[PDB]
Amino acid sequence: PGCEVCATWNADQAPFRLFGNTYYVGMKGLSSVLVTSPQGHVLIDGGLPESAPKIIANIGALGFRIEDVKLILNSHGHIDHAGGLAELQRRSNALVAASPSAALDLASGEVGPDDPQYHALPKYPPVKDMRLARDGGQFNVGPVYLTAHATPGHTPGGLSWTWQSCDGPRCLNMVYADSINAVSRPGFKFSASSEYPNALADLRHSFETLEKLPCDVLISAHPEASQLWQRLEASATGGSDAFVDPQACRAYVAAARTLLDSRLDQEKQ
Ligand SMILES: [Zn+2]
Ligand SMILES: [Zn+2]
Ligand SMILES: [Zn+2]
Ligand SMILES: [Zn+2]
Secondary structure, eight states: OOOOOOOOTTTTOOOEETTEEEEEEEOSSSOOOEETTTEEEEEEEEOOOGGGGHHHHHHTTTTTTGEEEEEESOOOOOOHHHHTHHHHHHHOOOOOEEEEHHHHHHHHOOOOTTTTTOOOOOOOOOSSEEEOOOOTEEEEEEEEEEEEEEOSSTTOEEEEEEEEETTTTTEEEEEOOOOOOOOOOOOOOOTTTSSSSTTHHHHHHHHHHHHTTTSSSSEEEEGGGGGGGHHHHHHHHHGGGGGGTTTTTHHHHHHHHHHHHHHHHHHOO
C-alpha cells in the first residue's frame, strides 16, 4: 500500500553543512534545516510524520542533539512540512513558530477550506504549543536571529525565513524559501476560488517579496526546486562555494512565475 510520491520525498539523505552554522538535516524530497549555536539550535520544518525520526537521526549524525533544539520554524501547513512537527516538539520541548494561517492547520492536523489541497491530504499529528510568526517577525535563540517573511500563494499561510551565517569574518545571507508553486487538488482554481480569493494577489506579492531578498544561500522547502542535489554534488570538490549563488531567489521566482503562467492558461481554457 505504498505511496510512491511520499516514499520518494522521504528517502534518506545524509546530512551536511551548508555554510557556517547552517546544516541540512532533511530528506531527498523534503527540506529540514538546522541552525546551531552554543545556546541551542533552530530547526526549520519537520517533513512528513515519518520524516521526524530521520531528521532526528540526521541531527545526531552531525554531532548535535534534538534536545538542544530550542525553536522550531514552519514554512507552511501541508503534511509534508508539518507532519513531523509534533514528534520534533515532543523530543525537543521546543516551541513551534508558524503563520497565523498555518498555525490553524498545525493545531488541528489538517488544512482548512481555503487550502488548494483541502480534502486531498491526510490528517497529521496536531502541534500542541505554538507561537505566531507574522511578516517581519524576528525570532532568536541566543545569537542566531531569524526573520519571517509572509509568502503565501501555494497556501494562504506560507512563510519564508532569513538569517545570516558566518564562517569567521565572512557573513552570508541565508534564505529558506517556502513553496510558491501553483499546484492543487484537481478542480481547484487559483484564478477563481471562493474560499481562497486572494490566491493570485498572494502569489504575485510573494514573487515580489522573494525576488528582492538578500540571497546568498538558498534552501527551498522542496530541495530540488533550488537544485540542492546538483549543488551538493558540486560541493564534493568545490566546497561551500557550490551552495553560494546570489541570483538563486530571483531564479526561484522566475521559475514559479513560469509555472503560474502555464497554470492560469490551463484554468482559462
Ligand atoms: Zn503520499
Ligand atoms: Zn505544500
Ligand atoms: Zn511540500
Ligand atoms: Zn472535495
